[PDB]
Write a protein that binds this ligand. Structure first.
Ligand code: BN1
Ligand code: BN1
Ligand code: ZN
Ligand code: ZN
Ligand code: ZN
Lengths: 258, 258
């Protein structure tokens, strides 16, 4: 009866409270999605338990085994009843799970160490001195892997064959790589995350250029789940009442340090 | 079998071609949604007929009779099979009809005659010299009617009682009113349209301030329609293929004249 929620440890969506070792259950975490989960549950009328995705991934289907990993996998195989996280709504994913209307709009963007001579994706594609990559098992990698657009296809051709690997296991790893690369590495990640990091110490990174695409994050449930309808309506209601905008301001700027 | 498509004459979504008089059927029209309709039809494998919504409205429910008008009404009462137009995804609408994932992201915005002493919604709410209104039977009017935000609530209190009426029957009427009111009227409309008009002659209007909210347009179908699933997946594929962005560029900036 208690709804198992799968989510991912990604700041500021879900983070461990400093004194979590002395706290229990859902009280161990804080963040945008923790606040959202509480609201969704209250509006749909269900008790829930937050769980961090086992493999720490968002979700991709293995080309060879055809098995889904990440949060998507936990829903597909019945390990979780719902996913409340910054999970990108994509075709390949909507084919196996359901998504509520988006609770946040975003797009792929470029993150650079301040001072880096890069202003756009075209710039990256036309040079070689500055390496660039994306998250592994994510929607961004898939975006480049399938793009028919000249600039993006060129970028994918480079990234897929670059050595050492330009891909990272977690968003945090990508951000750290940018910060330690002395301007020789640019990271491709979603806009709102890029924006968030730009407001965090050491305030040494920034978003450059416009977004490469437009899409959104949605609350996911297993195909045919009975929670689907109510969750979707809850998201729409919460968006219209301004809760989502308040939560972004709370976790992004109200706590900004730059 | 031929799918009856309901849409609305709104530039640059659906417009009569310069030579429409010598054309028949779907050939009489051109625009973003005309192009989108053809793509959706091709991917879902259906033949269709474009029809212009009878009462020229988007869709609102009569508070007394509870009867829906506009494109929403044509779907609810079975007069149309699908709505392919810049129809805003809202809670009250999703309760009676189905919406595909967003094909365009936008937000409420402020349009002014160039030179008008207004920079934000707050500025409008604090003065009386400049009147401002919204479209009738639309999602924006509902936004202000339900807003509990100090500024927005204050604005609604004024608009609902303003004399003469600050509300308009069509988007065009609102734009024309701003242009001929010598800066004494400001119009609240959705960002994408505001931006479009700003790049059209006589280049005498401009969008000011940020969007008041964030939401999107979706393709709508009657509840339980057999087209729902395919249309939804089609929208996702088109966005990822870059088609939606291509269309935006084709009808917005490739035709700008300022
Ligand atoms: C929360 N967040 N910030 N960036 C990202 C991000 O950047 N590239 C990706 O593939 C992702 C993951 C993405 N949200 C997904 O659902 O796969 N997620
Ligand atoms: C295409 N377009 N530009 N502005 C609008 C607009 O501005 N205020 C409204 O209520 C609307 C209509 C809205 N899309 C709706 O679906 O009701 N629609
Ligand atoms: Zn710890
Ligand atoms: Zn609430
Ligand atoms: Zn196509």
């Amino acid at each position: 009866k208690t709804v198992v929620v799968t989510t991912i440890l990604e700041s500021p969506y879900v983070m461990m409270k400093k004194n979590h070792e002395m706290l229990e259950g859902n009280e161990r975490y804080e963040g945008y999605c923790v606040d959202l989960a509480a609201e969704i549950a209250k509006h749909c009328g269900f008790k829930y338990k937050l769980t961090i995705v086992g493999d720490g991934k968002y979700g991709a289907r293995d080309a060879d085994t055809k098995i889904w990993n990440g949060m998507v996998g936990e829903l597909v195989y019945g390990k979780a009843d719902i996913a409340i996280a910054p999970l990108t709504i994509t075709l390949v994913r909507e084919e196996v799970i359901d998504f509520s209307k988006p609770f946040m709009s975003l797009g792929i963007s470029i993150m650079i160490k301040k001072g880096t001579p890069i202003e756009s994706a075209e710039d990256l594609s036309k040079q070689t001195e500055i390496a660039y990559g994306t998250l592994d098992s994510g929607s961004t990698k898939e975006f480049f892997r399938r793009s028919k657009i000249a600039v993006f296809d060129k970028m994918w051709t480079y990234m897929r064959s670059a050595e050492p690997s330009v891909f990272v296991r977690t968003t945090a790893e990508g951000v750290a790589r940018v910060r330690k690369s002395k301007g020789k590495y640019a990271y491709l990640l979603e806009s709102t995350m890029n924006e968030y990091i730009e407001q965090r110490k050491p305030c040494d990174t920034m978003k450059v250029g416009g977004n490469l695409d437009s899409k959104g994050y949605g609350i996911a449930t297993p195909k045919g789940s009975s929670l689907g309808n109510a969750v979707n309506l809850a998201v729409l209601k919460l968006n219209e009442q301004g809760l989502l905008d308040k939560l972004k301001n709370k976790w992004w700027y109200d706590k900004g340090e730059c």
